[PDB]
Write a protein that binds this ligand. Sequence first.
Ligand code: NAI
Ligand code: FMN
Ligand code: SF4
Ligand code: FES
Lengths: 430, 85, 213
Amino acid sequence: KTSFGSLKDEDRIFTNLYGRHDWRLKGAQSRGDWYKTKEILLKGPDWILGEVKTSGLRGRGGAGFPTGLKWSFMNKPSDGRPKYLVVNADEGEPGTCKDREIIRHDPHKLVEGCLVGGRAMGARAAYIYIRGEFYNEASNLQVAIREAYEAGLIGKNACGSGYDFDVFVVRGAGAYICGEETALIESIEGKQGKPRLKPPFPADVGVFGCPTTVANVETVAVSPTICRRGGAWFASFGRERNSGTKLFNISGHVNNPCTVEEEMSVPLKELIEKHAGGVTGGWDNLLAVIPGGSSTPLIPKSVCETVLMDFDALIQAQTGLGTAAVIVMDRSTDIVKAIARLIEFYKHESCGQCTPCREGVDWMNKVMARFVRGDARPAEIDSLWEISKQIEGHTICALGDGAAWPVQGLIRHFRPELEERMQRFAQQHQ
Amino acid sequence: VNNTKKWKMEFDTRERWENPLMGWASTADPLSNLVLTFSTKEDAIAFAEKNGWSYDVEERKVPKPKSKSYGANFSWNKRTRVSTK
Amino acid sequence: ALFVHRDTPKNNPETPFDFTPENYKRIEAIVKNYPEGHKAAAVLPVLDLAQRQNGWLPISAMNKVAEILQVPPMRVYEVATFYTMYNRKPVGKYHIQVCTTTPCMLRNSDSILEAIQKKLGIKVGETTPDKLFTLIEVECLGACVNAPMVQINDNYYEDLTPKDIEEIIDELKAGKIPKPGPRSGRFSCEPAGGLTSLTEPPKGPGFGVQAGL
Ligand SMILES: NC(=O)C1=CN([C@@H]2O[C@H](COP(=O)(O)OP(=O)(O)OC[C@H]3O[C@@H](n4cnc5c(N)ncnc54)[C@H](O)[C@@H]3O)[C@@H](O)[C@H]2O)C=CC1
Ligand SMILES: Cc1cc2nc3c(=O)[nH]c(=O)nc-3n(C[C@H](O)[C@H](O)[C@H](O)COP(=O)(O)O)c2cc1C
Ligand code: SF4
Ligand code: FES
């Protein structure tokens, strides 16, 4: 296959994404969910791991780690400690609103995903760390989990397979850093959301010191669809090592901001012009696109013409895929105010554990608040660049990286706009 | 720990008294500020035997290696779980 | 805003707080989720329960959660001062949270914030003197395609104009309960100019299932 995009409705994984059907058990079983689950559970952990590895499924959380290779770290014998699949359902990333749609509208797909994943890694229970802001979505998911227990699908003797598996829902308390897997583990343990250090990875020391896999809502929910439909079916979409479908959240300055499931290597211009109707004022009105939520560096209009929305073609554009959250920023946008507000987000949402994020993200917000006004001299651009390089790679988790990256993207793609900002400040105040 | 590298030779501290004029620390011991540096112990012992000084020797107190494990802070059944981080 | 405590008369360890017996059954339900020997992991739901009983957390709910879970009280003080939901000061009954991060500031949530400020006569962080509405300004709430949006205590109010949030404040002042959804012509998150996807019927059970399963 050479072209990508224009995904058919019959090849979608997340049917009833839009809430138009019944999200409940009679609705989910009428859409293919909870079908032949016992036959998936009885064929072993190794068959499910082979289906996920063969499918080319990568991390839908945002890093794109190989999901089958991730889950195969848990296929190891016991030592007295139980094992836990823990579903990262926080989704505090700006631009990103897809896992809210998965929990609110397709909950039984997530519950069957917890069951098939916990069978695949020998896990004992499921902790869905849902965001505290997602209260109605949490009660929605708890009604669906009640419908899954009362039908005998999970709990004692899950789906009649001889396998016992619980599913819990732990609400958050309003912390973006609790979306990171180790800080999510630290938030489930009744502590501050301060990320652990790696190694120990969660597959060795995770929640409560047990073996644990923290996995995204999307990469958990699509796994029974991978086991039912096949590995080669999910591998046929997108490029090679970029296999599958993906949820895209087109927000910002578009005509129709929307969540849509789309094939993996779709062009960005085709996606924005088809599902969102294009940029407000046409495609010529486009100024910049933050391609995958706030952690990724932005790309200008000169790159959005031919770029593809998978992992590797955005890494070639010296940005990342991340959460696949397309934030569109047209010509009417002060981009420096937006990126300084984004650094304000990364200093209001940062747990203060280690030095470079705790100090330098506040210091980058102060330098960016002066760059909005232009109250600097241009040698503080490159200075700020060095500050980003003193944060990127020297922290514990990737929120220091996720805060160094937008500063680097803004400098790299709109250095002259910052320079003319500062020079017109310097002439109008002197 | 760079101040715990080389052996040193000091002496007993003799009397420091108050100067009546200024309250300064007057002293009569000439060897009160004499701190000698020796790379090994037996060089200091041979030096003290050479000058007739009666010497006492403390041995080098080294810290024993500890079992450091970051995963031990998050154990399952052990008391060494940290209460916060 | 401050992260130390000063013992005011209305906030001290002698401030009255105790759970209702149905809340004790709820705390039993919370503690029974977590494994034996890790009872401390029930800090964050139970303390949030101690916020849903009182509306806010004086320092007796922190002491009560530390008392019934047998954890040190400083370990609950860290949780109450770390997370942005544990209101440690008495908020109004409708705690309005306006999201003004970059995807909502692009879609002009500043106009909604100005509309709420001139409608209620207050600003960000202040409380109306009748103690109904607390207006603060929060980070990304996760409804970015439904931007610009606010949150009222459990509820999302999305795709808002200034007229829409004036309507919501009007139907909150009279005691009525609004509808927590997008206030534009769309339903949850779909493209506003009609469904560009998932118009076909979902096939149901047995579709595309590989053999040997
Ligand atoms: N989905 C969301 O809401 C958000 C997503 N992100 C994205 O998340 C990413 C950052 O996440 P991180 O966990 O810091 O990065 P990544 O390096 O650590 O981790 C992804 C997974 O890889 C596994 N892994 C990697 N190397 C391993 C090894 N040698 N042994 C065992 N396991 C290994 C980890 O266990 C982890 O579960 C970025 O791409 C960022 O864009 C960031 C913010 C929000
Ligand atoms: C600061 C930070 C916040 C994160 N927030 C989330 C999140 O909210 N949801 C999510 O699925 N992953 C989040 N991640 C990515 C996780 O570290 C991890 O990659 C993911 O939760 C599980 O990996 P997976 O892609 O195999 O599912 C975050 C990472 C960082 C550094
Ligand atoms: S760099 Fe920031 S987000 Fe990461 S452990 Fe440190 S304080 Fe936390
Ligand atoms: S930015 Fe306002 S909801 Fe995500």
